Design an enzyme around this catalytic site. Sequence first.
Site, mmCIF file in Angstrom:
data_model
loop_
_atom_site.group_PDB
_atom_site.id
_atom_site.type_symbol
_atom_site.label_atom_id
_atom_site.label_comp_id
_atom_site.label_asym_id
_atom_site.label_seq_id
_atom_site.Cartn_x
_atom_site.Cartn_y
_atom_site.Cartn_z
ATOM 1 N N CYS B 76 1.762 35.025 29.901
ATOM 2 C CA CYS B 76 1.164 35.796 31.023
ATOM 3 C C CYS B 76 1.485 35.085 32.312
ATOM 4 O O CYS B 76 2.675 35.029 32.685
ATOM 5 C CB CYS B 76 -0.326 35.932 30.632
ATOM 6 S SG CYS B 76 -1.164 36.939 31.870
ATOM 7 N N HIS B 163 -1.048 38.132 25.358
ATOM 8 C CA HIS B 163 -1.473 36.944 24.700
ATOM 9 C C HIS B 163 -1.319 37.006 23.196
ATOM 10 O O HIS B 163 -2.162 37.545 22.470
ATOM 11 C CB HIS B 163 -2.963 36.706 25.049
ATOM 12 C CG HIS B 163 -3.209 36.371 26.464
ATOM 13 N ND1 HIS B 163 -3.151 35.081 26.933
ATOM 14 C CD2 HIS B 163 -3.414 37.163 27.545
ATOM 15 C CE1 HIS B 163 -3.330 35.084 28.247
ATOM 16 N NE2 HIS B 163 -3.561 36.325 28.644
ATOM 17 N N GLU B 165 -1.798 34.558 21.230
ATOM 18 C CA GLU B 165 -2.763 33.675 20.696
ATOM 19 C C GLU B 165 -4.149 34.249 20.393
ATOM 20 O O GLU B 165 -4.962 33.534 19.815
ATOM 21 C CB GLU B 165 -2.908 32.465 21.631
ATOM 22 C CG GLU B 165 -3.546 32.734 22.980
ATOM 23 C CD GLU B 165 -2.666 33.200 24.096
ATOM 24 O OE1 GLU B 165 -1.654 33.905 23.876
ATOM 25 O OE2 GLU B 165 -3.026 32.889 25.261
#
Lengths: 188, 188
Positions: B76, B163, B165
């Site tokens: 990002c 994202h 993650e």
Amino acid sequence: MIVILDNGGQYVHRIHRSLKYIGVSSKIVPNTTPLEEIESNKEVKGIILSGGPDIEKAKNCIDIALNAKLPILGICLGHQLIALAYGGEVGRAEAEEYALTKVYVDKENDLFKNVPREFNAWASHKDEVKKVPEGFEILAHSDICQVEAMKHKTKPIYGVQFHPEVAHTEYGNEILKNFCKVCGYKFE
Amino acid sequence: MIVILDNGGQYVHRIHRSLKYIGVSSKIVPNTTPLEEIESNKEVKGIILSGGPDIEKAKNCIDIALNAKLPILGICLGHQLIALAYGGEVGRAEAEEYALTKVYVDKENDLFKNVPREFNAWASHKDEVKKVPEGFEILAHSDICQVEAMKHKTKPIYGVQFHPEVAHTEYGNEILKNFCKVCGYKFE
């Protein structure tokens, strides 16, 4: 402008970047660039011999160190190549990995104007100057290395074992600036 | 190990957790950590530039993106910082709030091995890459963002707008695993 002989190390672009931060232009060239081509360019005011992997692979630097008229600064391999050129000795040492090393300045000469008498430098001690050449003097040392910096007693030939061009070396840019002052550059 | 540069975002620990889930160790470090200290540690295999709040507050990342030899993934803010470092453009966009976004894979290379062509990703589009740098290619897009993912055409430099993650990103851990494969890790 400062010519940087690329001895194939990982910090060669850092020399150029660090010089640019203090206002000094520089050109990275092959380590096989003949001395006559370097010195006939009236824009050139000094030579830096960069770090790199192999002392056997940078013998044109020996001719440059012996025979250049322009000021010369050798960094790590470059410092070692200058010692060998002038008949000093270089060999293996213990602390091979890169680390912060507290350097003690023995003679202010330059290299160490406007630098404190102790500072931390980014350095690798895989190889070191074991015997300082005849007519050279030691300028700095550390707890593990007798020769962190040297110069010729009267000619503008300088060597540092550590890397002034990287950020972890305190006052690194001022050491570079001092060499540039020997090369005729002026700084406010 | 993978070094994660902490750009101050809320999902930095998620990167470490998600990497742990696929068996890869990582160390979160200050975003001011110099590149030489990263690359001299022979345990480090790659670098992730995390999300965070301020593109002006993470310029050591620009030096890392330009000059690292290790593979890099920017997430990002990280993706944005990589674009800016290589001369692309970044700017404001409309959909600022976090939402599930359907992402279309245009080029598998890699990030998207073993990922379906379309998948849902957790993403904020407050800022976006407006112009991909010279020498980069787009890998994925959404209905509201032309550059959901990009990479350098030949160097192992990757960026994702979303994202991977976080749990809401389908196949997030496989995208991370693909980056880890470029870093030399083996899975199976």
